[PDB]
Amino acid sequence: KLXXAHXXQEAX
Amino acid sequence: KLXXAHXXQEAX
DSSP states (O other): OOTTTTTTTTTT | TTTTTTTTTTOO
16 A cells, blocks of 8 residues: 555654 | 654555
8 A cells, every 4th residue: 555665664 | 753653554
């Protein structure tokens, strides 16, 4: 839904 | 930053 969260970078 | 995005579920 979140589009990848900037290739995983915004997971944190 | 996004707190886990609901344990990975909101990645999409």
